[PDB]
Amino acid sequence: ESKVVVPAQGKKITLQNGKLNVPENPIIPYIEGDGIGVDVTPAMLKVVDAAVEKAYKGERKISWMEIYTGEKSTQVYGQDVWLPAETLDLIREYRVAIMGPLTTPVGGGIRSLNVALRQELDLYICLRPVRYYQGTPSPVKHPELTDMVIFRENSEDIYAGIEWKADSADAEKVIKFLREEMGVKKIRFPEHCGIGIKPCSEEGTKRLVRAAIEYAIANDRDSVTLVHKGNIMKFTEGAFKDWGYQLAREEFGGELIDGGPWLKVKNPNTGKEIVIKDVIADAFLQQILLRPAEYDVIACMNLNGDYISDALAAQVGGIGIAPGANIGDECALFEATHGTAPKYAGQDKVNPGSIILSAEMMLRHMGWTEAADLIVKGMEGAINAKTVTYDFERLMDGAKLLKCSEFGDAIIENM
Amino acid sequence: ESKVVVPAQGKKITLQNGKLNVPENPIIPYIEGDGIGVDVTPAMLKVVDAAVEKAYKGERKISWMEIYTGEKSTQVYGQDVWLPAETLDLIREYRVAIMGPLTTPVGGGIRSLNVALRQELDLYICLRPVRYYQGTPSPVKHPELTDMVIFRENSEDIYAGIEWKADSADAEKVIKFLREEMGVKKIRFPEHCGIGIKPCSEEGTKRLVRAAIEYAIANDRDSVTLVHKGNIMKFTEGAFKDWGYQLAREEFGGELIDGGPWLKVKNPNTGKEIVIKDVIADAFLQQILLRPAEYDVIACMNLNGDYISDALAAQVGGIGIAPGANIGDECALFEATHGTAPKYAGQDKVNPGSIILSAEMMLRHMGWTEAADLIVKGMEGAINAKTVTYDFERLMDGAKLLKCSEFGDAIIENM
Numbered sequence: 001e002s003k004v005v006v007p008a009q010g011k012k013i014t015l016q017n018g019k020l021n022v023p024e025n026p027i028i029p030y031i032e033g034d035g036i037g038v039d040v041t042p043a044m045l046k047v048v049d050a051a052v053e054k055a056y057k058g059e060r061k062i063s064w065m066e067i068y069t070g071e072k073s074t075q076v077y078g079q080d081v082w083l084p085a086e087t088l089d090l091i092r093e094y095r096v097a098i099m100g101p102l103t104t105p106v107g108g109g110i111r112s113l114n115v116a117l118r119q120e121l122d123l124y125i126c127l128r129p130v131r132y133y134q135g136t137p138s139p140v141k142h143p144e145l146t147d148m149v150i151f152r153e154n155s156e157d158i159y160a161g162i163e164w165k166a167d168s169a170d171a172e173k174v175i176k177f178l179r180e181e182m183g184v185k186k187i188r189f190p191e192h193c194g195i196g197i198k199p200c201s202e203e204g205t206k207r208l209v210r211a212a213i214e215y216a217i218a219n220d221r222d223s224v225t226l227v228h229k230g231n232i233m234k235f236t237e238g239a240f241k242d243w244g245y246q247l248a249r250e251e252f253g254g255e256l257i258d259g260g261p262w263l264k265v266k267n268p269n270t271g272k273e274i275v276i277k278d279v280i281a282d283a284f285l286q287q288i289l290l291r292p293a294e295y296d297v298i299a300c301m302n303l304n305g306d307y308i309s310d311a312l313a314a315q316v317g318g319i320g321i322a323p324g325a326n327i328g329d330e331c332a333l334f335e336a337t338h339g340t341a342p343k344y345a346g347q348d349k350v351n352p353g354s355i356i357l358s359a360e361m362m363l364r365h366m367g368w369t370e371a372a373d374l375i376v377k378g379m380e381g382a383i384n385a386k387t388v389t390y391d392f393e394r395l396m397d398g399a400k401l402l403k404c405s406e407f408g409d410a411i412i413e414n415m
Numbered sequence: 416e417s418k419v420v421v422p423a424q425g426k427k428i429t430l431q432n433g434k435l436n437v438p439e440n441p442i443i444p445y446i447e448g449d450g451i452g453v454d455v456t457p458a459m460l461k462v463v464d465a466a467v468e469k470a471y472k473g474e475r476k477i478s479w480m481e482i483y484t485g486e487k488s489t490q491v492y493g494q495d496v497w498l499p500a501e502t503l504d505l506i507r508e509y510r511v512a513i514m515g516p517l518t519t520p521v522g523g524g525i526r527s528l529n530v531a532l533r534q535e536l537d538l539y540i541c542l543r544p545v546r547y548y549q550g551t552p553s554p555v556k557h558p559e560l561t562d563m564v565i566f567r568e569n570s571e572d573i574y575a576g577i578e579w580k581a582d583s584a585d586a587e588k589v590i591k592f593l594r595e596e597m598g599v600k601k602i603r604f605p606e607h608c609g610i611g612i613k614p615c616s617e618e619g620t621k622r623l624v625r626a627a628i629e630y631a632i633a634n635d636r637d638s639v640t641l642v643h644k645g646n647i648m649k650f651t652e653g654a655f656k657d658w659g660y661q662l663a664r665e666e667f668g669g670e671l672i673d674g675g676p677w678l679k680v681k682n683p684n685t686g687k688e689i690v691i692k693d694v695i696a697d698a699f700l701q702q703i704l705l706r707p708a709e710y711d712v713i714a715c716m717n718l719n720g721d722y723i724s725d726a727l728a729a730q731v732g733g734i735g736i737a738p739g740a741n742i743g744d745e746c747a748l749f750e751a752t753h754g755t756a757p758k759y760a761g762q763d764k765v766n767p768g769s770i771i772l773s774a775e776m777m778l779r780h781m782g783w784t785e786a787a788d789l790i791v792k793g794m795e796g797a798i799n800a801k802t803v804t805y806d807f808e809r810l811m812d813g814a815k816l817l818k819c820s821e822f823g824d825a826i827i828e829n830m
């Protein structure tokens with residue numbers, strides 16, 4: 001028996017010709033999130049409602065609908081109901097949803113709930129923009145030079161979760177097949193050996209890279225960088241790079257720069273020549289620190305995207321305010337990107353900035369760009385005013401310490 | 416017919432009871448390296464010779480012996496002789512060797528020559544210390560807080576080079592086996608799909624972690640951090656973490672801190688309690704920027720170690736002066752960690768700091784700690800004096816620009 005309540009007032013968003021049809025009163029599913037989700041989610045709801053109200057003068061209003069996943073789901077639906085089938089159904093049905101951080105249990109063989117949501121809903125784009133907000137305390141000298149957008153492939157790579165435990169019958173079966181049937185000789189220690197599988201496909205790669213290039217065109221960005229470790233992993237990471245460049249050539253008229261390998265893609269709207277290039281992943285983690293201004297849109301595989309998004313967020317002082325979206329062809333799920341921080345849960349203390357900026361991304365995705373712009377403006381003003389939560393304030397002199405809820409108010413005040 | 420010349424004066428280092436027996440006149444094989452190897456290698460030879468001469472008053476002297484790998488090997492031994500068998504034999508026979516950067520060709524199905532050397536010689540430790548040298552221009556505000564030592568597992572992980580090309584008979588054979596025999600359902604796109612294998616073993620893990628803990632004890636370090644992505648890759652990365660903690664318990668008397676999971680290991684020489692802890696890899700790339708002082712010795716798998724060593728090097732301004740060793744139970748190969756930078760090759764321009772500090776590590780490994788200390792002192796003085804190569808100088812005001820060879824002289828001058 002479902003415990004979700006469909007709002008009496010509200011219409012569902014629909015999808016036609018690859019375009020969202022968003023009514024003035026859209027029903028938006030939201031997952032509160034565990035731990036500090038109880039603090040940041042109500043701040044997000046208030047801030048989004050204010051931005052919507054101010055932008056469209058009361059003509060538009062979101063009908064929020066609570067749905068369940070994580071620790072709260074077990075309390076609502078019962079033991080071991082960590083991810084109800086209806087949550088998958090509802091997100092797909094209502095097209096656009098948002099969630100706080102999620103608790104994935106240990107000891108019950110349950111894999112990451114975040115990853116489960118991404119994979120089961122085929123949300124193959126993990127979209128993570130990282131920019132600097134003036135006034136944010138940062139560990140680097142020039143965080144303002146960082147303005148990048150990560151397209152992280154969300155459906156393949158070693159995240160597929162194909163692996164077998166050392167000394168298990170399955171692992172030994174796989175290892176025997178590799179050694180005796182594939183003639184594999186390069187497993188250093190075949191005994192007591194865990195095994196993981198890393199897939200990378202042409203279709204998987206190209207749908208991700210296609211979205212990254214379309215984003216660069218739509219938003220007049222300067223370049224798309226394919227980041228990969230293709231010199232060591234030729235047939236997965238290296239193939240990702242090859243297919244990315246091929247896609248730029250075959251679908252976007254990519255032309256060779258100089259003697260290559262970089263390509264230029266002409267923006268059909270602005271005439272700007274978008275550079276398509278590539279960087280080896282370890283070097284890239286250096287280049288984002290040393291030459292951040294040379295990078296813009298980034299396209300990379302699942303694990304590399306995980307690392308890159310964290311590293312970039314840290315450097316701009318944005319560990320706790322990094323927005324994120326998981327986008328597929330039929331629906332999209334925006335998310336707080338930090339953890340659940342249970343020690344602070346319910347103290348109205350932690351930074352709601354991440355889930356709020358994810359909500360900004362959500363509004364933009366819905367075509368409600370005015371409301372989204374108001375959130376960005378409010379976030380810029382509040383941070384610039386040094387009226388901030390403890391995680392910022394502890395690193396600054398002369399800041400005003402705000403509760404989580406109060407920081408939400410400051411954002412609204414600066415819209 | 417070998418083109419290596421064994422020095423008439425010189426004795427080979429031997430190994431007894433796991434201890435190097437280094438004579439006063441050791442023969443040390445060296446690989447010049449391709450590209451800028453022609454610049455940095457002679458600077459290294461001069462600097463090492465000066466340090467040895469000054470430390471031991473002419474009682475000791477290295478008999479350098481050139482051996483071949485990379486582009487130079489093809490010119491010495493002929494077409495497609497990129498890595499002669501004798502080079503493997505010689506490094507093993509002479510126990511301690513050093514190399515400049517290597518060119519690995521593209522288009523001939525040759526995998527990384529660096530990786531080949533590590534794997535064929537079973538040099539399972541990639542040892543990369545990263546500290547700050549005062550005066551170095553850095554992109555971060557507090558690089559002096561970074562003083563870490565990376566133990567990167569060098570023999571397993573996705574570096575095993577087990578993989579098959581998309582649409583190849585082999586890949587399809589593997590994919591069929593996975594789907595039909597292992598009942599694998601989580602490959603999103605089984606067609607046009609490259610496949611890689613990720614092994615992690617108990618013996619591989621423990622020999623690496625054992626070296627990391629022994630290093631912490633020997634050098635009175637504060638903690639060993641196991642870095643892994645075990646929440647997603649349970650049976651490889653997660654197993655690495657489990658086996659690392661288990662090793663600390665079973666071999667080093669590790670005791671539980673509080674309610675865990677951190678352990679304390681008592682240094683048998685100093686009484687210091689060494690903390691054994693762990694951090695998820697994406698978070699770790701944040702924590703090295705945000706809380707670098709909380710980290711010391713790091714133990715991690717091959718790919719993560721690749722990324723971590725690059726990220727740390729970048730942050731301390733050490734991209735071009737990061738030392739590295741590849742150490743096994745029978746021999747050790749110290750290396751320039753940067754690339755070959757062919758555009759500057761032969762211009763006496765690039766920074767010899769990396770290969771010089773790798774040589775410092777080499778001398779220390781040989782038990783010639785006085786000579787090693789002189790190199791560290793000379794490097795500290797030269798950099799502090801702002802008498803530096805262009806890669807530093809271009810980022811500074813009021814520095815004196817030195818050629819590669821001149822920077823080597825400055826190091827000697829500051830010993």
Ligand SMILES: [Mg+2]
Pocket residue numbers: 306307310697
């Ligand atoms: Mg992550």
Ligand SMILES: [Mg+2]
Pocket residue numbers: 282721722725
């Ligand atoms: Mg590397």
